[PDB]
Design an enzyme around this catalytic site. Structure first.
Site, PDB file in Angstrom:
ATOM      1  N   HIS A  22       3.198  24.393  22.815  1.00  0.00           N
ATOM      2  CA  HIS A  22       4.055  25.521  22.342  1.00  0.00           C
ATOM      3  C   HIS A  22       5.440  24.981  21.909  1.00  0.00           C
ATOM      4  O   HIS A  22       6.244  25.735  21.386  1.00  0.00           O
ATOM      5  CB  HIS A  22       4.185  26.629  23.462  1.00  0.00           C
ATOM      6  CG  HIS A  22       5.106  26.337  24.648  1.00  0.00           C
ATOM      7  ND1 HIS A  22       4.766  25.868  25.811  1.00  0.00           N
ATOM      8  CD2 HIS A  22       6.481  26.497  24.745  1.00  0.00           C
ATOM      9  CE1 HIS A  22       5.811  25.744  26.565  1.00  0.00           C
ATOM     10  NE2 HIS A  22       6.901  26.129  25.938  1.00  0.00           N
ATOM     11  N   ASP A  80      -2.252  23.814  26.760  1.00  0.00           N
ATOM     12  CA  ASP A  80      -0.850  23.652  26.250  1.00  0.00           C
ATOM     13  C   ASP A  80      -0.334  22.245  26.418  1.00  0.00           C
ATOM     14  O   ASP A  80       0.453  21.963  27.299  1.00  0.00           O
ATOM     15  CB  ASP A  80       0.089  24.643  27.006  1.00  0.00           C
ATOM     16  CG  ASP A  80       1.500  24.738  26.375  1.00  0.00           C
ATOM     17  OD1 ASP A  80       1.683  24.237  25.271  1.00  0.00           O
ATOM     18  OD2 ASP A  80       2.314  25.334  27.069  1.00  0.00           O
ATOM     19  N   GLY A 127      13.703  25.973  28.269  1.00  0.00           N
ATOM     20  CA  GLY A 127      14.564  24.811  27.916  1.00  0.00           C
ATOM     21  C   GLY A 127      13.934  23.622  28.611  1.00  0.00           C
ATOM     22  O   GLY A 127      14.109  22.487  28.211  1.00  0.00           O
ATOM     23  N   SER A 165      10.626  23.639  29.179  1.00  0.00           N
ATOM     24  CA  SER A 165       9.270  23.609  28.564  1.00  0.00           C
ATOM     25  C   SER A 165       8.944  22.228  27.984  1.00  0.00           C
ATOM     26  O   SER A 165       9.799  21.616  27.359  1.00  0.00           O
ATOM     27  CB  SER A 165       9.197  24.628  27.415  1.00  0.00           C
ATOM     28  OG  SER A 165       9.632  25.884  27.947  1.00  0.00           O
ATOM     29  N   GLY A 166       7.730  21.819  28.228  1.00  0.00           N
ATOM     30  CA  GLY A 166       7.237  20.505  27.727  1.00  0.00           C
ATOM     31  C   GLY A 166       7.552  19.312  28.639  1.00  0.00           C
ATOM     32  O   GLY A 166       6.980  18.253  28.495  1.00  0.00           O
TER      33      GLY A 166
END
Ligand SMILES: [Ca+2]
Ligand SMILES: [Mg+2]
Length: 223
Positions: A40, A84, A175, A177-178
């Site tokens: 995402h 994801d 922020g 994320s990942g």
């Protein structure tokens, strides 16, 4: 990260900041030429920033390298966020040193109760907005799948796991994320989603990396 602490400069040497003119997601360095992040977080025009601590100040240990290609998982579903995960190849090999290191992929999955380290430059308030400039850290355990599924009925698949505190207070947030979830020295998760940040009975949801090691190894060897 809400309820976490300042990591300390370059104490999480495999942490990466994905920048498209500003920091928008975190990622993990798995070897000198590849980064793993969340699907995402996909965008065209990404510059990977390694060796960062304050993302608004060039302190001397950074390496900014553009991405040559991005590969989102073949089965990524943006509606449920199932699968994801994405791989980013660097245009140049990063120079590994004490401040820039890669993290190892797992040989097996981890058990509920295992403590992990989650890090990132995301929001630090549960109700409000405050984006830090230095890297924040949080130690949180993997929760049982039953507590994860009761919190999100019909939304958790075998490729996701929850980590955190049901009492709320401590959690990853937008922020972040990942970014990485490292347990016992292995990358076991990727910050994926949740419900708000640090709310009671709404733990964070992470991509379960142990389910993608074959796809990761096969994909980087062929690209
Ligand atoms: Ca910096
Ligand atoms: Mg992060």
């Amino acid at each position: 990260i809400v309820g976490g602490y300042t990591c300390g400069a370059n104490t999480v040497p495999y942490q990466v900041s994905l920048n498209s003119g500003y920091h928008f997601c975190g990622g993990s360095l798995i070897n000198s030429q590849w980064v793993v992040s969340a699907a995402h977080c996909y965008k065209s025009g990404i510059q990977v920033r390694l060796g960062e601590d304050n993302i608004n100040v060039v302190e001397g240990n950074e390496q900014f390298i553009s991405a040559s290609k991005s590969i989102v998982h073949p089965s990524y579903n943006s509606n449920t966020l199932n699968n994801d995960i994405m791989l980013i190849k660097l245009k140049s090999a990063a120079s590994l040193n004490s401040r820039v290191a890669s993290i190892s992929l797992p040989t097996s999955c981890a058990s509920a109760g295992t403590q992990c380290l989650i890090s990132g430059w995301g929001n630090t308030k549960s109700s409000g907005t405050s984006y830090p400039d230095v890297l924040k850290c949080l130690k949180a355990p993997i929760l049982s799948d039953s507590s994860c599924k009761s919190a999100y009925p019909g939304q958790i698949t075998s490729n996701m796991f929850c980590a955190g505190y049901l009492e709320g207070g401590k959690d990853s947030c937008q922020g972040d994320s990942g970014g990485p979830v490292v347990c016992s020295g292995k990358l076991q998760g990727i910050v994926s989603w949740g419900s708000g940040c640090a709310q009671k009975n709404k733990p964070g949801v992470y991509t379960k990396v142990c389910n993608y090691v074959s796809w990761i190894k096969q994909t980087i060897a062929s690209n």
